[PDB]
Write a protein that binds this ligand. Structure first.
Ligand code: HEM
Ligand code: HEM
Ligand SMILES: C[C@H](CCC(=O)O)[C@H]1CC[C@H]2[C@@H]3[C@H](O)C[C@@H]4C[C@H](O)CC[C@]4(C)[C@H]3C[C@H](O)[C@]12C
Ligand SMILES: C[C@H](CCC(=O)O)[C@H]1CC[C@H]2[C@@H]3[C@H](O)C[C@@H]4C[C@H](O)CC[C@]4(C)[C@H]3C[C@H](O)[C@]12C
Ligand SMILES: C[C@H](CCC(=O)O)[C@H]1CC[C@H]2[C@@H]3[C@H](O)C[C@@H]4C[C@H](O)CC[C@]4(C)[C@H]3C[C@H](O)[C@]12C
Ligand SMILES: C[C@H](CCC(=O)O)[C@H]1CC[C@H]2[C@@H]3[C@H](O)C[C@@H]4C[C@H](O)CC[C@]4(C)[C@H]3C[C@H](O)[C@]12C
Ligand code: FES
Ligand code: FES
Lengths: 359, 359
């Protein structure tokens, strides 16, 4: 009987096939909510065509592309089935995928949401921890959309802008870690170092007051608390790109460092991006890993699987949307506060957009 | 009857009067566990001699010195009181103050503990969040003492090396925040920005894998959690000393940035050091205060009071020692893992010292 409440699942998206790498990078380097460059409209196209090969090669190393679209759709379907039974008064619920750099683009999703004449629209970020470069950018695109077209929303908007410590999210992480620990030799289970690895941020972003580092750190603590501190751990940062300073310890140097110090069993945990993505140097480069073994004698380096399709995850997503609906919140209290050194005038416009929504 | 169980309260200490500033700084710049300098025994004395004036001036700005000794004794007394009732089997309990850079020095306390013929010693750090530069140095001192004294412990040791999320520590923080929120105008109370301010670390220490940032971030989340996210917040880092890069955002830069962006009511929270200490630029310099208020219109900048003498705090300390005793742990799981890029050979020796303890 026609969709009443829409759930816009926000994420950066990812190249479906190596053939999509170029336009993925193009939009990424063009995103001013993510980064600002001189003559950006001219430089973005250049940087894209340039790194495309290097990035296609990395995706080939992981299967030939990103499975984010499929995974997100599967979780989206599962979330809906639960919501339709959990919240009959807001049903039927329908999910929309809003990727930032690839189709379905955020704008394309909003446009479709408007045409379906939904009553309520929920901007639901798929990043548990908040960064102005990920969730912030996705939220800004929504504000940018209506402002671009030059007209007001025909729907009631609200947002779930962060959920770093949602109990079911923490349970899923704990479950996957225990599962992977089972794959290490029984005699070494106790010695396994749990290395939580999240994507790093440039120090310039960290220093302007980005919320991300603190929230990822919160997720980590909740997870270890659930696991009753069964193993030692560290929160490290990966995939750092460029010569500029990024928040460390770097994941690669940390793995090597740990091996040089006798820790031969390591469990990497994707603590800040719920879908499979590009792995680290010691996981992909046979040369680097072999040397590490010859010199330090590394025994086991495993990675916990992504929350990809765990049914308990869809339940996590449905639980979040449900609670949100019951609370009547328009956004978290944290969104009402911009970075201390924020220099993007769109940010607060986006904030007002959500806090000023009807209902 | 004689002291059965001894509780060694570890901290860096602080100059009791302006006259004690020099040797405080001398012992600090000489600390290898906190700082590694070339020909350190040569440069330390010089640095101390040169910084004394500036540091004496800072302490004068806050009353003439540090109240850490008095406060730690009072808390220690209260802790012992509660312990003799809570843990009859390990009673009588006696607390010893072990400061790193001032009397009573860590070594003096150990030496006295030995003479008291205790049946069990507990190295209890007063820093709830672990850093190799704070708790690590104090623990390494215990190992360095027995090692340099060329003798073995006559007591069975164990350590409470961290407690970033202890439920009563969190309750004390929330109580002090609510209490301070009451000092702002009722109409503006919901507009107050809670700025958790912790002492920063050099980026070189952060990148080596220091545990501190993630643990401080955990304390913050637990506190806001208890406060049910009543106000927006940010975790910033203060007193970064020197020209080298330290973890930001800086407290001074954030306060200014915030004011320039409309946030006129700010509540500073001493989230990582439980005793009064040097305040920030906008709390001391009258000139910066004026400039800021003139071109930003700051309305209220308040600092929550240090957990200094809150009885619930003494209760927190006793609750910790009690659980620690019943758990029979020798140290936390986290202490068994060194920084992935640790280059201090003593660290690993200190670890073995505690994990190898009898019982
Ligand atoms: C302002 C901070 C950030 C900047 C400047 C940034 C930049 C970039 C760039 C340039 C790429 C393209 C890859 C390349 O060309 O080498 C990329 C990819 C990516 N970024 Fe970020 N990023 C930031 C923060 C984040 C955060 C917080 C996350 C976490 C969820 C993240 C997740 C990703 C993912 C998942 C990819 C796809 C690559 C992969 O699978 O590893 N990024 N980022
Ligand atoms: C490894 C990194 C650190 C370095 C290099 C460092 C260095 C210093 C120095 C040189 C001083 C003397 C004052 C000055 O010359 O400016 C000082 C004082 C002090 N430090 Fe640190 N420190 C570090 C980490 C920390 C941490 C993590 C804490 C947190 C508990 C801390 C708490 C203090 C306190 C409470 C004082 C007394 C002065 C004040 O109130 O600011 N320091 N530190
Ligand atoms: C000058 C600008 C930084 C401006 C600023 O910080 O205020 C920096 C950041 C991005 C840099 C560009 C990107 O790194 C992409 C290219 C990298 C090449 O090695 C040089 C040209 C190249 C096009 C760089 C030119 C210049 O160093 C840029 C444009
Ligand atoms: C890694 C990439 C260059 C890739 C390449 O040359 O092949 C460079 C070029 C543009 C750079 C970004 C832009 O200079 C804009 C930002 C500048 C800040 O000082 C750091 C973050 C910041 C977001 C930079 C991160 C990183 O250094 C980037 C993304
Ligand atoms: C060279 C050494 C760093 C060595 C290293 O990183 O391997 C650095 C760190 C501490 C520095 C010293 C400290 O900053 C104290 C002094 C600061 C003055 O501005 C220069 C001399 C001065 C004495 C510095 C000399 C030199 O730059 C030092 C000694
Ligand atoms: C803060 C102080 C300068 C104070 C002043 O000029 O008033 C400077 C001079 C010596 C510096 C220290 C020395 O350079 C030795 C270390 C160098 C590392 O890169 C950072 C930590 C490190 C321990 C430095 C901390 C801080 O930058 C110090 C202590
Ligand atoms: S960059 Fe964080 S609020 Fe604008
Ligand atoms: S410096 Fe952290 S364990 Fe040695």
């Amino acid at each position: 009987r026609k969709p009443k409440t829409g759930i816009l699942m926000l994420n950066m998206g990812g190249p479906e096939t190596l053939g999509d790498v170029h336009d993925f990078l193009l939009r990424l380097f063009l995103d001013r909510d993510l980064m600002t460059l001189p003559i950006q409209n001219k430089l973005a196209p250049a940087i894209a065509k340039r790194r495309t090969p290097k990035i296609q090669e990395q995706y080939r190393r992981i299967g030939g592309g990103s499975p984010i679209k499929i995974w997100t759709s599967k979780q989206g379907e599962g979330m809906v089935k639960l919501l339709d039974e959990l919240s009959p008064n807001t049903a039927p619920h329908k999910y929309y995928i809003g990727f930032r750099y690839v189709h379905p683009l955020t704008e394309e999703a909003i446009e479709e949401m408007e045409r379906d004449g939904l009553e309520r629209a929920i901007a639901f970020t798929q990043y548990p921890q908040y960064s102005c470069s990920t969730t912030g950018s996705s939220l800004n695109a929504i504000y940018r959309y209506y402002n671009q077209v030059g007209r007001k929303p025909t729907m009631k908007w609200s947002t779930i802008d962060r959920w770093p410590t949602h109990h079911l999210l923490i349970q899923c992480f704990a479950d996957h870690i225990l599962k992977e620990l089972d794959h290490f030799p029984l005699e070494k289970r106790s010695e396994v170092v749990i290395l939580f690895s999240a994507h790093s941020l440039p120090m310039s972003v960290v220093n302007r007051g980005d919320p991300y580092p603190q929230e990822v750190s919160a997720t980590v603590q909740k997870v270890m608390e659930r696991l009753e501190y069964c193993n030692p751990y560290r929160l490290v940062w990966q995939s750092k790109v460029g010569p500029m300073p990024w928040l460390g310890p770097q994941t690669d140097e940390s793995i090597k460092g740990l091996c040089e110090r006798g820790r031969k069993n390591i469990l990497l945990v994707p603590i800040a991006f719920t879908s499979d993505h590009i792995e680290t140097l010691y996981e992909l480069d046979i040369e680097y890993s072999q040397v590490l073994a010859k010199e330090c004698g590394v025994e086991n380096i495993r990675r916990a699987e992504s929350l990809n399709g765990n049914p308990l995850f869809s339940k996590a997503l449905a639980d979040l949307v449900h609670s949100h609906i019951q609370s009547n919140e328009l956004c978290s209290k944290q969104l009402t506060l911009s970075c201390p050194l924020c220099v993007n005038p769109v940010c607060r416009e986006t904030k007002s957009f959500f806090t000023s929504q009807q209902l």
